[PDB]
Amino acid sequence: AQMSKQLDMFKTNLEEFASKHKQEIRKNPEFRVQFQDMCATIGVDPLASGKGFWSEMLGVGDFYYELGVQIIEVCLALKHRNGGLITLEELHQQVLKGRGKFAQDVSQDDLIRAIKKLKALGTGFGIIPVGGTYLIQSVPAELNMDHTVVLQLAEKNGYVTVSEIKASLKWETERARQVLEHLLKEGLAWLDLQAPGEAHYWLPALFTDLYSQEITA
Amino acid sequence: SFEWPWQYRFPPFFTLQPNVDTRQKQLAAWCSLVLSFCRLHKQSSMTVMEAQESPLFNNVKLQRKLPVESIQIVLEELRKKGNLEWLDKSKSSFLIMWR
Amino acid sequence: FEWPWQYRFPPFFTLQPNVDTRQKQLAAWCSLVLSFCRLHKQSSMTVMEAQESPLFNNVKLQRKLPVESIQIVLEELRKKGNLEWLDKSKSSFLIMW
Amino acid sequence: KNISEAFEDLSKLMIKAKEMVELSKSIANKIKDKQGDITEDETIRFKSYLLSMGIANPVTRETYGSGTQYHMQLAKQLAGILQVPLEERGGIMSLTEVYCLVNRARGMELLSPEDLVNACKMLEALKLPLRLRVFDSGVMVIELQSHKEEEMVASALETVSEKGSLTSEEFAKLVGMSVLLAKERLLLAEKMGHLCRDDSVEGLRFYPNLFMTQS
Question: Among B53, C71, D88, D113, which is most exposed with the fewest C-beta within 10 angstroms?
Answer without folding.
Answer: D88
